[PDB]
């Protein structure tokens, strides 16, 4: 196997175990976990533990978004580089490496004879990491938890077009209710859960007063209510999405469902756009390019 | 280069994640706990295999009906020294095999921990799997030990042919 392939494997088994130790913290605290969310529940309308079990399962079937912009990048040159990378593939990088540190507890993770390959190091002058060995493919890709079904996405403010993942990539994420890198997050580990226990989520996600409020979003879809979300809903940072770390790769377009296209937010025109939707979905016999 | 999709189920501690990353790194990687799902492409003889890692869609079989129409092949790993859930096994291969979405993709079995000394050999995994009572359906079954690496390529063999 080449070198770098396997500096690429190991960087994913180190993200394999990040997500493994946040997996065990929730199944540490299940029982505290699920007496806050029946709490939360009780407090805000009846029968919790099956509100509390319709909130998970639409945690649960959302869809998982990435928000582009198709207008300062080129969505071809995005498609044919065959994989979507994070922002280690920039003195930008620093904060997130401190952020992913201290918000997944990545210390502890330092015996794992994986830990070379997903530890920076520190960075150098140039805001690269000092360590030969780190690889991109050990910090996770961001996306959103789109339970409401934005208009543009889960987070808009990356851009208007987006790509709906397939739903079995939710099963490597963990989720938190604040962008990690945002205040109201707090660097607070216990704020993030996983694919197998969004009751913590429940009992983390905001309840604000004014805004945008998941919580009664959230309890209002459970019980079946149409109505159409907040105009604030995945359109700022902190609270206003569901922040989701995938934790692997996202190749294109194996783990695609759908690219939503933004019409009016492209450096390409209507024929053109309608043109590459016509070619790229005809040569992958599904209707996975969709415009809008 | 041609691809073939792989779907690698079966009962938890069958030996699946040691198995790809012994396929693709050709090491014995730590075991970590598969939350959800690993997912490794393999070169061999001319081909690349796609081959998903699934920890378990027990809870979770809507989330993997969407690449069931173009999984190519089925593989199931068993603990053949765990006398006491090779038909929890058994019910669990039916379960996959039940799915109509897959019913064009071949079958291989890896009969896992040969190494073991109290270890069934592959005879009688395909009795107490009930592979001779399958109908309609490519299937073959191959002894393997995950950690030395016999029999995975005679598997890999196999699908090559299925091809
Ligand atoms: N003796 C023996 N142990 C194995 C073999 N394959 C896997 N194991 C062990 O079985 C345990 C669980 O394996 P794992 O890959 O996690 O199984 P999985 O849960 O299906 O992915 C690990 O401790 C492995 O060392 C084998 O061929 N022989
Ligand atoms: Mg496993």
């Known amino acids: ?292 | 280069r041609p691809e073939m999709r792989i779907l690698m189920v079966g009962l938890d501690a069958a030996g699946k994640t040691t198995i790809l990353y012994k396929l693709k790194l050709g090491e014995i990687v730590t075991t970590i706990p598969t939350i959800g799902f690993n997912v490794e492409t393999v070169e061999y003889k001319n081909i690349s295999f796609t081959v998903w890692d699934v920890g378990g869609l027990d809870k979770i079989r809507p989330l993997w009906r969407h690449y069931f129409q173009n999984t190519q092949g089925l593989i199931f790993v068993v603990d053949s020294n765990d006398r006491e859930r090779v038909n929890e096994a058994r019910e669990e291969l039916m379960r996959m095999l039940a799915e109509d979405e897959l019913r064009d993709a071949v079958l291989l079995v890896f009969a896992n921990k040969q190494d073991l000394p109290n270890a069934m050999n592959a005879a009688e995994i395909t009795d107490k799997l009930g592979l001779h009572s399958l109908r309609h359906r490519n299937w073959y079954i191959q002894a393997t030990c995950a950690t030395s690496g016999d029999g995975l390529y005679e598997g890999l063999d196999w699908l090559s042919n299925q091809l």
């Open chain 1, 1 to 292: 196997p080449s070198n770098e392939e396997r500096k690429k494997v190991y960087g994913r088994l180190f993200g394999k175990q990040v997500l493994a130790h946040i997996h065990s913290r929730c199944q540490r605290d299940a029982d505290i976990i699920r007496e806050k969310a029946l709490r939360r529940i009780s407090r805000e309308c009846i029968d919790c533990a099956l509100l509390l079990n319709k909130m998970v399962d639409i945690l649960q079937n959302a869809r998982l978004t990435i928000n582009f912009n198709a207008a300062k990048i080129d969505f071809v040159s995005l498609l044919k580089n065959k994989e979507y990378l994070n922002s280690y593939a920039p003195a930008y990088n620093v904060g997130r490496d401190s952020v992913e540190t201290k918000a997944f507890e990545l210390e502890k993770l330092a015996d794992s004879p994986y830990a070379p390959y997903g530890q920076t190091g520190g960075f150098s002058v140039a805001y690269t990491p000092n360590s030969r060995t780190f690889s991109t493919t050990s910090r996770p890709i961001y996306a959103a938890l789109d339970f409401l079904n934005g208009e543009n996405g889960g987070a808009s403010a990356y851009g208007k077009s987006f790509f709906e993942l397939n739903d079995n990539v939710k099963t490597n994420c963990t989720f938190s209710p604040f962008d990690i890198y945002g205040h109201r997050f707090g660097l607070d580990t216990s704020k993030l859960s996983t694919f197998w226990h969004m009751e913590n989520l429940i009992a983390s996600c905001q309840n604000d007063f004014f805004g945008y409020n998941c919580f009664k979003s959230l309890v209002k879809m459970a019980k079946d209510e149409k109505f159409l979300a907040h105009s604030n809903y995945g359109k700022g940072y902190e609270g206003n999405y569901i922040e989701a770390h995938i934790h692997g790769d996202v190749c294109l377009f194996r783990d695609i469902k759908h690219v939503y296209l933004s019409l009016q937010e492209n450096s390409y025109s209507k024929s053109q756009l309608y043109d590459y939707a016509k070619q790229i979905n005809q040569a992958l016999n599904r209707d996975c390019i969709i415009l809008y």
